[PDB]
Write a protein that binds this ligand. Structure first.
Ligand SMILES: Nc1ncnc2c1ncn2[C@@H]1O[C@H](COP(=O)(O)OP(=O)(O)OP(=O)(O)O)[C@@H](O)[C@H]1O
Ligand SMILES: Nc1ncnc2c1ncn2[C@@H]1O[C@H](COP(=O)(O)OP(=O)(O)OP(=O)(O)O)[C@@H](O)[C@H]1O
Ligand SMILES: Nc1ncnc2c1ncn2[C@@H]1O[C@H](COP(=O)(O)OP(=O)(O)O)[C@@H](O)[C@H]1O
Ligand SMILES: [Mg+2]
Ligand SMILES: [Mg+2]
Ligand SMILES: [Mg+2]
Lengths: 471, 478, 471
């Protein structure tokens, strides 16, 4: 067998020279395992991924860990295949890094286990399934104004501190508890404090037994941050390919994935794109998202969180992410400051599943009425402040009277909000929430104080709160 | 004796290229024939790119270059307390040498995802706005960002001074400052008594670029030694922007491919690797913690720039300072509308949470109606009522320089403001009202202070209301 | 052997090849002297400073004058040391160029005189000494809103044609005439006309008997423009150290130093940094700035004018030099155009000495109140332009009324400006400034017209001007 040698070290970028005619393929993984020959050296256990073929039997590679300690001339072992990760029933309840090595300190995966390569072509045209089914989540705003589609891609856009991580945790809890399906979490560019909190929350709540978690942390090189999403996708694809399940893939942040890609491109020396991003941004995003599709055997649905820098939706990462989403959700610090969690904007959120023939005529009419009332209320807030609502017409007074209650009733208490407030969460079926909103629109509860509608689940709980306060 | 050697080819701008040195490691230290150290960063086919950690005027082409076989390490220990040192660990204030018995690698692994515990205890800064609206806990990473001359240094100095009675060790790292500013800061700390538990690490502007590049890592390496013994440490990085500028200079001189704004591709990797080392250790690992306050200086208020965005995406929360608020009389200039803190609530005592719950909502309403306030008093009665409440809130949150406040007094004054007891005092008298209220609480009502201090909860509601009314019976309006 | 040979000539950069093993050290001064051998050559007398070692026995240098007439193959002499300039008592009353050769036609320095190398390390932390003392200048804006510090470092920012040179001349006229120490002036990249006028002015005033002057102007090559400032600083450092004497150091335009560095950086083989500057912008400027300090044995107070290219305050050269100063005043084209000189921005200017325990409680409160009123007037500028002055509230109108009068009263008549106008100028003490601004703030003089406050000294002159106007 023939081995390589280290030619250059320039940070996280390493060049390896092989024997002529034995070059590894692009995306093949290489292994460096070295023990110190003397006191002036250190042990090295490092892996590299092939990026380019430079010519003269030389290969340009990106490292998946720290390259400190490398010496020009160390032996490099060719694995003969892309990065492979353990897969199947063994992965449930474990925490993994980018390479598929456990980090939960619970023991190693047996070496005889099946492993799959990360890089593979997307499913073909002939084998896709295009049926549309509504996915129930139990959250009022989501189930009413922006229904989710089984097998589709859903994005959550927002700035810092708006509640994306909490909302993803609540979605995981609700869907896993009420549907019993398998879920996979991919922590792309995960903060270590947040990852530890998430792991402890899952362990405490018991959801961990049905979930496999992959973590690529901020203190890791850009290649490691880049490939974690694909590792999670590879772990998720098995359950629908070999077992025909319905799986949920939660991706922590696409923005950090694009940032890692841009860092890798700049390290490789390519010419920067529009605002410094990589030229291959669209192709990378496509090769990530296009594998999340429904087929005959099974379906994967993805809930993705997006970070918008300085509220700039024109930014290339959100801009090229938008093209792949079936439903989008916009979170507002404006709503968060007022106390309305989950702080979903009821007018900026859109979904292709909000159609009369998909959700039903009553559902569609109720949602459209709610949106119209909120839109009309948006034009009276300014006038009311300068001259009170008694200046306006009689109908607009009722419009405001009902829009305040609609705004407050769009908020809900979450199970994961226990650690913040102490009030237990609730799961609201779509058939219940549509009836509640229809009743509020038609005025059956116009007499109750508006504070009774804040942080409440089903409609009867509003009446209960009004009774408690002494209406 | 034996030593693998090389020959210098090029010298200039603080960068040396050496032929030979076959078995040198990436990041290894290397010494010249002059007797100055250097760090090897570029390992190429036929040459080694060396960054020089000292004056390069004495190095000439053809000189000998020798391996050392050691990764960079920094001295650590108790003796560093009260001293001013450079990133290499050498004292610069005189006062004799430093007796340290241990060393730590300047680059070391961060604590694992399983080594940590969730942040649950507060870091008291003594700034009312920070403690009420943007809480900071022990183990958190908070970014202080703003334009020049907005109080960024003042916030850090006030925090370090306020850690006097808490069991915390503070480390102040100065990057790119002229040594006069550093000496003035040291004098201020000595005057206020903070040098008894503070380590100062300085990298002046005239020092070579690699020292500015390495200084924050030296500081965090000094901090981790105390962290792993069970202590609590606070680290302040004075200018990550100047660190990044120095690193960009080095990368351009080594001819690495440039990214946006000529920065290298690993500029985010550098800062993430630095900041992720601040952590809250679990009770199995000792229970110690290290909390960090990185600084970023922007130009013309542009927070979409490369380094500001990179640092924002890493930290748990950010604090925004604005000259608009600074010159309008609102100093400290925290913009509570934009500032965020994900570790809020857990980083506050129960009384502080109880009182700040209403304060957040009141400020949110005032920020909305400030847009309509330009039309005078021609407003619906509730609107100018809320404006009057917001104006008093803003006056209360105001605070002068180097005057830390106990948390019990903070919660009491916030309770007084938020329950409506201040609704009859004129806006021009709020500062004097608070100043007299603190003396009144010192003379009488020590039981409320003791109750808050011991049980971390609000005192009996009746007693507090009676005390506030008794004080208002003695306050005299202008 | 110290004999070299010229290899390349590319503008102000020359490459010299030496015998192996005898390269000159960095910053050494090399002399090229050549007499014409035939009618197709010209005489050469040129000084070069070593910059880089390129390997292969080749050194890249920078020329201190024009390289016209250089021929590949001239002999170069190594002097074995950096540039050395005459220093001490012989330098008082003389005018020098970058090389330390007098240009005032008063004779040549004796060949035995002491000379000091240009390049040296900066003083140390334990050597530095700190203390704050207000430096009274007699200018209302400086004395009130941004006091100068005796022994501190003062920078005067401003675009093209705003007034920083006139402010330098006024400060010289107000302080240098009685300072009691040594004065040093270093003109970098400024007008030869200005240098000549200042020299004759100092001869007339008699200050020249205790002043040393170094001139490298905009007609000089970047080699000389990069080193004239260091020559002047070296002259000042002797008086600081070997005699323990107070020094006034004036630098005419410190920005031209970095401009020349950027001009020459491209030819040295460095990759360009942001907006075309050299990668070593911060270190090169720091190595110069940190030498200008006050130590235990002597004090240096320095006033620098810092040109701002194209009125861009975010340019890297102005942005980097901000951290090196104790007190700054930012001149503004907007204020210059309305006619209120010295056109200092009253909010952008800051000083380290504006503290209650340094200037006094009353002074601090008055300054802060003035700044608050000016900021409020600045904020009202959109509503005033759109809705008109009539609809502002009672308090806003009073704020505008006080603010315009304050902004006008901040202007002053200068002694050196009597060349543009017949008004003789004035010197205003700090007590007078504080009392006058306090009286304006208390609403005493609201009955006077706005134009009475323009270009006057003490507050009584406002009453005099109003009475001339008829009040
Ligand atoms: N709360 C405050 N009350 C009064 N003065 C203050 C306050 N905070 C800061 N200052 C003053 O404002 C000035 C600038 O503050 P500081 O130097 O801390 O700002 P900075 O943003 O760190 O500046 P730099 O950009 O120069 O590093 C100082 O004179 C300081 O005393
Ligand atoms: N205090 C002042 N009083 C009256 N006129 C002034 C004053 N300051 C500046 N001016 C006017 O503005 C001009 C600016 O002159 P000055 O040489 O000081 O400018 P500068 O900012 O140094 O510009 P440059 O970069 O072109 O040298 C003066 O010639 C004069 O016409
Ligand atoms: N439903 C909720 N109830 C109360 N607080 C919440 C809720 N959702 C989020 N928060 C608060 O918001 C903070 C940050 O939310 P996070 O999940 O980090 O959003 P993002 O990840 O988008 O910044 C948390 O510290 C939490 O206290
Ligand atoms: Mg998040
Ligand atoms: Mg500062
Ligand atoms: Mg000028």
């Amino acid at each position: 067998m023939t081995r390589g040698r280290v030619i250059q070290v320039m940070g996280p970028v390493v060049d390896v020279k092989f024997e002529n005619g034995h070059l590894p393929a692009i995306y093949n993984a290489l292994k460096i395992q070295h023990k110190a020959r003397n006191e002036n050296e250190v042990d090295i256990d490092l892996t590299l991924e092939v990026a380019l073929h430079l010519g003269d039997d030389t290969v340009r590679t990106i490292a998946m860990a720290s390259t400190d300690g490398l010496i020009r001339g160390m032996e490099v072992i060719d694995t003969g295949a892309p990065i492979s990760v353990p897969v199947g029933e063994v992965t449930l309840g474990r925490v993994f890094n980018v390479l598929g090595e456990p980090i939960d300190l619970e023991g190693d995966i047996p070496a005889d286990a099946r492993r799959d390569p990360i890089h593979r072509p997307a499913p073909k045209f002939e084998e896709l399934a295009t049926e549309v089914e509504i996915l129930e989540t139990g959250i009022k705003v989501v189930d009413l104004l922006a229904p989710y589609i089984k097998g589709g891609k859903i994005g959550l856009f927002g700035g810092a501190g708006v509640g994306k991580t909490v909302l993803i945790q609540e979605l995981i809890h609700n869907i896993a508890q009420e549907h019993g399906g398998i879920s996979v979490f991919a922590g792309v560019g995960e903060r270590t404090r947040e990852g530890n909190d998430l792991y402890h929350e899952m362990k405490d709540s018991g959801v961990i037994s049905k979930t496999a978690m992959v973590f690529g942390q901020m203190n890791e090189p850009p290649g490691a941050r880049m490939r974690v999403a694909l590792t999670g996708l590879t772990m998720a694809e098995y359950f629908r390919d070999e077992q025909g399940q319905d799986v949920l893939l939660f991706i922590d942040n696409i923005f950090r994935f694009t940032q890692a890609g841009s860092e890798v491109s700049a390290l490789l020396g390519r010419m920067p794109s529009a605002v410094g991003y990589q030229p291959t941004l669209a192709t990378e995003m496509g090769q990530l998202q296009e594998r999340i599709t429904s087929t005959a055997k099974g379906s994967i649905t993805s809930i993705q969180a997006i970070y918008v820098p300085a509220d700039d939706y024109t930014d290339p990462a959100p801009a090229t992410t938008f093209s792949h989403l079936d439903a989008t959700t916009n979170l507002e610090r404006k709503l968060a400051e007022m106390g309305i969690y989950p702080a979903v904007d009821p007018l900026a959120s859109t979904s292709r599943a909000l159609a009369p023939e998909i959700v039903g005529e009553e559902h569609y009419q109720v949602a459209r009425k709610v949106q119209q009332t909120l839109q009309r209320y948006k034009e009276l807030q300014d006038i009311i402040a300068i001259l009170g609502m008694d200046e306006l017409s009689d109908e607009d007074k009722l419009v405001v009277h009902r829009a305040r209650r609609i705004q407050f009733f769009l908020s809900q208490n979450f199970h994961v909000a226990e650690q913040f407030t102490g009030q237990p969460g609730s799961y609201v079926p779509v058939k219940e929430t549509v009836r509640g909103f229809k009743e509020i629109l038609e005025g059956k509860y116009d007499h109750l104080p508006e504070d009774a509608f804040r942080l409440v689940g089903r409609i009867e709980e509003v009446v209960e709160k009004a009774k408690a306060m002494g209406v | 004796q034996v030593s693998d050697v090389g020959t210098v080819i090029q010298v200039g701008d603080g960068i040396a290229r050496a032929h030979g040195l076959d078995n040198v490691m990436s990041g290894e230290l290397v010494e010249f024939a002059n007797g100055v150290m250097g760090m090897a960063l570029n390992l190429e086919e036929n040459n080694v790119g060396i960054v020089i950690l000292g004056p390069y005027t004495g190095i000439k082409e053809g000189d000998e270059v020798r391996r050392t076989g050691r990764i960079m390490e920094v001295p650590v220990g108790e003796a560093l307390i009260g001293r001013v040192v450079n990133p290499l660990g050498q004292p610069v204030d005189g006062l004799g040498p430093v007796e340290t018995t241990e060393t730590r690698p300047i680059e070391s692994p961060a604590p694992g995802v399983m080594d940590r515990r969730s942040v649950h205890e507060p870091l008291q800064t003594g700034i009312k706005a920070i403690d009420a609206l943007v809480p900071i806990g022990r183990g958190q990473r908070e970014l202080i960002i703003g334009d020049r001359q907005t109080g960024k240094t003042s916030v850090a100095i006030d925090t370090i001074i306020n850690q006097k009675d808490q069991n915390m060790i503070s480390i102040y790292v100065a990057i790119g400052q002229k040594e006069s500013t550093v000496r003035t800061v040291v004098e201020t700390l000595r005057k206020h008594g903070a040098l008894d538990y503070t380590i100062v690490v300085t990298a002046s502007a005239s020092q070579p670029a690699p020292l500015l590049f390495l200084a924050p890592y030296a500081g965090v390496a000094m901090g981790e030694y105390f962290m792993y013994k069970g202590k609590h440490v606070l680290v302040v990085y004075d200018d990550l922007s100047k660190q990044a500028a120095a690193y960009r200079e080095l990368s351009l001189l080594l001819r690495r491919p440039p990214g946006r704004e000529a920065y290298p591709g690993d500029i985010f990797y550098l800062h993430s690797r630095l900041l992720e080392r601040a952590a809250k250790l679990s009770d199995a690992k000792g229970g110690g913690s290290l909390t960090a306050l990185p600084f970023v200086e922007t130009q013309a208020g542009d927070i979409s720039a490369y380094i500001p965005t990179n640092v924002i995406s890493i930290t748990d929360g950010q604090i925004f300072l604005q000259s608009d608020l600074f010159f309008s009389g609102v100093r400290p200039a925290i913009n509570a509308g934009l500032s965020v803190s994900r570790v809020g609530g857990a980083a506050q005592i129960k009384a502080m949470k109880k009182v700040a719950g209403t304060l957040r909502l009141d400020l949110a309403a005032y920020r909305e109606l400030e847009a309509f306030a330009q039309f005078g008093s021609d407003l619906d009665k509730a609107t100018q009522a809320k404006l009057a409440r917001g104006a008093r809130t803003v006056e209360v949150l105001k605070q002068d320089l180097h005057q830390p406040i106990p948390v019990e007094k903070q919660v009491l004054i916030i309770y007084a403001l938020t329950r409506g007891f201040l609704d009859d005092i004129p806006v021009e008298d709020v500062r004097r009202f608070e100043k007299e209220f603190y003396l009144f609480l010192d003379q009488n009502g020590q039981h409320l202070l003791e109750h808050i201090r011991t049980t971390k909860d609000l005192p009996n509601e009746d007693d507090l209301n009676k005390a506030i009314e008794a004080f208002k019976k003695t306050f005299v309006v202008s």
